[PDB]
């Protein structure tokens, strides 16, 4: 896949096609929803989940007290510094995971398509499938709706792929 | 025929960090750090006392201008930075501990006791504390002075037969000069001992002037003790005693003190920070480190963006 | 792969086949052992590894002491809360890794098979390989034992795949 | 021909958390949180004292019913919640620090010293401490009283010429009334100062009654000091002194005190928790936060399941 | 891929070939540089990034003080133990990521090659491509420099692959 | 034709840990734990005082051999383990707090004040402190004694009209015997009270000998107080007073004290550890836990190797 689609607004993942009827696009709502559910799940585990504290040590001081204060300040700074570490690590792991997650779902969509189009298509390096049966709309929707039957077209697609 | 697969893209995404790179463009990212407070403290669900000019200790002792705090309860007590006392000056050793104890109890519920202060004069007052335009004193303290030029030693045995702990607040007077101590107590020197079965406190009054505050060279020290059920509070004093009038209840609890100059508005919010209430959906905040309630954790990062989208373009 | 095999008990990963001799199954013990070794390794790094402490601060208190106790309690609560965080994160990372690990080993098994059956088989979306040589038992064991020679069957399998 | 690849499945798996979902079915998962203690404390590999009714301080001082603890050693000392003293009542300022020090030393090994308590009467006793049906006193303390109505100031210089630190435990008597102080010490007031080259302690006895405990209005305070090799312990006292009889050794160490009502059984286990011993294979536990030895970390999670299997069905 | 190349020194990832001109090898500098940039990035986020502290609690003690010291020591030990945990976890995650990273880049190189050699090559289990056009040097460099045109050779490669 | 893809390999790689295995061979790995210090402390960018034999307190008080530290500044003060005082012996209650305060201020900048020590004799000396071969005393203290067999009570009101806090260091003398106290102060007993508006300190001198140190049975205790702008320092004393000569400034700051026997060389390095300076590129170190400046974190791991390469062979 070379680039994204600025005009695709009905989902995150989808298909665009070119046939003899015309050009157009639609989202794959199962791929999109799966990506959405995992992301929302991760957000739900974090956002809205806080802990309740009521009484704590003093954090702000106005006078010199000596070693008791040095420790009370030390303890609080240690806690903050360490939670800041956890926060940065957590976000970086979550973001690394999120981008790998969405790319994984895209690869799954691609494989679903080549596995459904068994031997009726070639993988191009631009993220597109060359389809060797001259299909118009109905195959495209069938592929989108996981009902494409490779046994219908192989007899006509193979001779336009390997036999020329 | 050609069938292309791909992702949506947006005209303008946002930038997030990952573990391999610091700057990757993403469609949409949810900021996880609540920067921005409302600017006011919300008045619910928590019960909050405003503390107009009333340090939790002035409210405890009964300062002339804190008489509206008698028997109040709170989940959160708020002290204003402008608060000042307006009564006889005082010195609390280990101020911080008394302040914490009262704060966590969460109440100034007080009950009077039938103390037997006999052979002494009760209700001593000072021009330092004006209430109703007359000289008065802290409402929860009883300043004892001689009666007919006699200050007999006191000996009060006040048992705890209830099922709760009783907190007694009492103090020690430190007259400016020998002249004042003899005038007030008919003693050349005093001494105070307060005990329970578990512990004992004793204080020797320190006569001498300190720099004048509110034109007063003299001071009162505040001490406290806790009496467990089954114990007996024993007070023995030859002079300079600022007697208790009763006891405060102690509750275990969820209450505390915050210092804040924020106003209290009409709002519902669980997380309170000195800079007002903060919505608590985001997991982290960088508004302050002093918080109360179900708050986000404090971090030093100004921003953290969690991708919700995918790599753009 | 659509579902698992409730009857496979001699390993975690394996093969099931259908030929003219009959139907049956067996585990792939190299795939299974590799999965087992990584899992046991992860467990060994954690389970049985504790640190020894002897003297610590008081954690339980019966009396009101003041600010010294507030700090001693604060310090302990901070430690617990933070270790609870580490414990949850650790387990979630280990479990995310374990399920991705086992699926990875399964994908490796699948690729090993299609790479060994070079052009003699088609990937079906149900996780099965359609084999175009009419093999009976010996090929199946040969594939299981990494000795299948694609150069033996291509001459007969290709004409039953593309030439029909 | 058809060759299918796949995974095993089980009729009933278990549920584990991951980072993308909270509930994923897995074949088998190893619980990582040891909930459940044995219910008894194991007696090995660690050396454990039971502390039948003996607070580590009562054992230290030599309470009439703790005479079986003389010169004992432990890795772990256990205090029972039912323990009570049965001797003259006492008050240890900073009780917690003395308790920690003795606890970590791990021993009550004690050696007598040739103290020169001269011109005074040694071995003073009280009906408070009954041993062998006779009035006695704490076995490691020497209560000095006047001799022939005279209590000369004492001055004991006891040098440390050994290679180890010496811990001296001593106290101060607080008679109920003036009558008792004069009866016992032939002084109207006493004073105690104890010093080393590095530091000095001084105590003024506080005469007066406290609520009676075991019918006794009077109390003894306990103080301690550490003498380093090369130093000299100097004891100067005009009265109210509960003298040391010798010193305790201090060891650096791995010992401590746990509070527990659990019985001690016949078992081998490294991790000890107030609720008995806990097997220490799992990395986390949620039994308690108070532990001793090579224990799992305490977490607030009731469960943590680590998949050992794979996604089911 | 069975093993590595001890003699490849001009990059980390690369190609080795055998044709009628001879045998030889060269690095793929785009694959190598991408791997290098991600690794150096990770190192830059960690190495050279320290925090400045000036005044802290005492960590070394020479005398018995009582409970105040027990806490001051406890706090420091907690901090160290916990940062040691973070350090080990961090390195293990970074190393797990680094080895998966470099293998990922290798798989990307392999796919780039099979996607460029559309149907003109077979994947061997040893990590090599069997190329069915008898190419000499120029195809090899063309593949290395992402300019190989599969439409030039399919007419001659297919008949030496499937038609024999 | 054949085209093979693959990775480089090296004759000898290194071993790193991952999450699934402990020992995986890798081409190259960057050690992340700085073990090895330089062995000397670098003299820049930080300003470092060597402290040849000068404990920060001896430098503060003005010990005869620490006269080269007057008005010095530092980011880091280093104490040598060989330091010893060579002046009248002293005892600082809460030594650790005074030491921390002075250390963080980062300066011994001192200014003299026009104190009105009148009716007493100023500049008292002792053979304990020899400077220039003559008896002297600590340079920042003024030991007051009687004048014409009279020691009138003192009363010094020294206001703070400046914009900074003033730190006053003063002490209390504890003569060995009654003979010495009467000789020096013409009093049978003394007493010292020092106060501000915010707080009060009071000390009762303790007469009696301690083991002799440097042949001296007597000692001086050191106390300190902080005066805020707008306040007044009030000193009232009948005897045994070691008076201040002026005040030290307090700065908020980034300064501290490290104990180290390392020499200070000619080098530039940001991270300082007792075992000298440590290069600060690696994120972790295992040299020590005591550090100053932009240092690596201390870990207990001896090694951590972060792969920079890939799996070998
Ligand atoms: C798939 O799409 C085609 C064309 O719209 C339609 O005929 C077919 O019924 C669809 N299949 C299902 C079940 O979605
Ligand atoms: C960004 O994602 C959040 C979910 O966290 C969603 O509520 C919000 O509307 C999204 N914004 C855009 C640009 O769609
Ligand atoms: C605070 O977070 C909000 C999003 O909730 C963001 O719009 C704002 O720019 C942030 N402010 C800063 C400067 O951190
Ligand atoms: C607080 O003090 C200020 C100054 O006297 C006064 O104007 C204000 O009314 C006080 N607030 C209350 C109501 O106590
Ligand atoms: C206690 O109170 C009663 C009530 O007047 C009084 O008779 C008695 O003198 C008091 N007892 C004491 C403390 O003397
Ligand atoms: C002191 O005033 C209180 C009012 O709180 C009163 O109840 C008490 O009896 C008074 N005592 C005397 C001696 O008038
Ligand atoms: C006050 O003291 C005087 C002198 O001792 C005494 O006569 C009188 O009875 C006392 N009490 C009264 C009633 O004033
Ligand atoms: C110092 O304080 C005492 C307090 O009793 C006072 O008597 C004395 O006059 C004060 N000193 C002077 C001379 O001001
Ligand atoms: C000391 O001087 C101050 C200055 O006004 C004065 O108030 C005080 O009485 C004098 N004596 C004492 C008691 O310190
Ligand atoms: C919160 O209050 C603190 C202290 O008053 C201040 O430093 C900080 O800037 C405030 N933050 C916000 C978000 O207003
Ligand atoms: C593989 O299995 C076949 C059939 O059992 C057997 O003939 C062959 O020897 C096996 N190969 C090896 C070496 O495992
Ligand atoms: C679950 O896995 C553990 C290894 O941690 C193993 O010992 C146990 O027997 C397994 N249980 C089952 C159901 O096989
Ligand atoms: C405790 O862990 C065991 C497994 O070791 C488990 O069987 C038991 O149900 C757990 N108990 C609870 C309620 O946490
Ligand atoms: C502990 O005290 C109880 C109550 O007197 C007694 O029955 C028991 O024997 C004591 N245990 C020992 C042996 O000290
Ligand atoms: C010390 O002990 C000896 C032994 O009887 C005795 O002669 C001497 O009087 C004692 N010394 C003192 C402290 O007077
Ligand atoms: C006191 O009793 C002890 C027994 O521990 C004995 O050794 C000592 O000499 C006795 N002292 C006197 C004065 O009898
Ligand atoms: C006890 O005191 C008396 C009176 O001072 C004295 O005569 C006697 O010698 C003293 N000692 C004896 C032996 O009782
Ligand atoms: C208070 O305690 C002192 C202790 O010396 C005692 O003399 C006095 O009698 C006690 N007070 C009363 C009257 O009980
Ligand atoms: C005070 O009253 C109690 C009550 O019995 C009594 O024991 C004590 O002697 C009295 N005096 C003192 C000393 O507090
Ligand atoms: C362990 O002991 C504590 C305190 O006694 C108790 O709250 C907890 O329930 C006990 N836990 C178990 C597992 O028995
Ligand atoms: C690729 O390599 C071939 C052979 O060296 C060369 O002819 C061709 O121009 C190269 N293509 C590019 C643009 O790198
Ligand atoms: C190892 O990698 C580092 C980068 O961290 C590099 O500077 C060093 O030269 C490498 N060593 C080798 C063997 O190339
Ligand atoms: C310390 O780290 C260096 C690499 O910077 C390494 O060469 C040395 O062997 C390590 N020393 C030890 C024993 O940790
Ligand atoms: C430190 O003390 C030693 C021993 O007297 C002395 O030799 C050395 O010169 C002193 N260092 C300085 C210069 O103070
Ligand atoms: C203060 O100083 C002046 C200067 O000599 C002197 O006249 C006066 O006696 C002193 N004041 C006091 C403290 O008596
Ligand atoms: C004490 O010596 C100092 C030198 O620091 C001098 O300025 C001061 O005036 C002297 N005082 C007397 C009484 O000589
Ligand atoms: C010292 O004291 C004597 C005796 O009171 C007195 O006459 C003399 O004036 C005082 N001062 C001098 C000048 O020595
Ligand atoms: C104990 O110290 C006091 C200090 O005033 C001293 O008088 C007494 O002589 C000392 N005791 C002896 C007899 O050494
Ligand atoms: C006690 O004995 C020591 C031993 O030399 C002596 O220095 C001291 O004066 C005596 N008295 C005191 C004051 O403790
Ligand atoms: C650093 O100093 C400490 C204490 O002096 C010592 O234990 C440690 O071995 C030293 N480390 C190094 C790397 O020299």
Residue numbers in the entry:
A (entry chain E), C (entry chain F), E (entry chain D): 10 to 173
B (entry chain B), D (entry chain C), F (entry chain A): 11 to 323
Q: Could you give the paper's own sentences about this structure?
A:
Therefore, we collected cryo-EM data of both endo H treated HK/68 and Sing/16. Indeed, we observed significant destabilization of Sing/16 but not HK/68 following endo H treatment as seen from the cryo-EM 3-D classification results. Specifically, we observed that ~ 57% of the trimeric Sing/16 HA particles retained after 2-D classification exhibited some level of protein unfolding/destabilization primarily in the hyper-glycosylated head domain and to a lesser extent in the stem/membrane proximal regions. By pooling the particles from the well-folded 3-D classes (100% of the HK/68 particles) we obtained 2.3 Å and 3.2 Å-resolution reconstructions of endo H treated HK/68 and Sing/16, respectively. Both structures were nearly identical to their natively glycosylated counterparts in the protein backbone. endo H treatment of HK/68 resulted in a similar uniform distribution of views compared to endo H treated Sing/16. Interestingly, by comparing the local map intensity around individual glycans between the GnTI- and stable endo H treated 3-D reconstructions we found that several glycans were incompletely digested by endo H, most prominently the glycan at N165, which retained ~10% and ~ 50% occupancy on HK/68 and Sing/16, respectively. In addition, 6 other glycans on Sing/16 also showed incomplete de-glycosylation, specifically, N8, N45, N63, N133, N246, and N285. Finally, we measured the thermal stability of both HAs before and after endo H treatment via differential scanning fluorimetry (DSF) and observed a marked reduction in melting temperature of Sing/16 relative to the fully glycosylated sample along with the appearance of a second apparent melting transition. The incomplete de-glycosylation observed after endo H digestion has two implications; first, that the increased glycan density in the HA head restricts endo H access; and second, that the partially unfolded 3-D classes likely represent a subset of particles where these glycans were successfully cleaved, or conversely, that the glycans with partial occupancy in the well-folded trimer classes are particularly important for H3 stability.
Hemagglutinin (HA), the most abundant glycoprotein on the surface of influenza viruses, serves as the primary antigenic target for neutralizing antibodies. HA is a trimeric glycoprotein with each monomer composed of a globular head containing a vestigial esterase subdomain in its lower portion, and a stem domain17. Each subunit consists of a membrane-distal polypeptide (HA1) and a membrane-proximal polypeptide (HA2). The HA1 subunit is comprised of a globular domain (residues 116–261) formed by an eight-stranded antiparallel β-sheet motif that includes a distal shallow pocket corresponding to the receptor-binding site, surrounded by the five immunodominant epitopes (A-E).
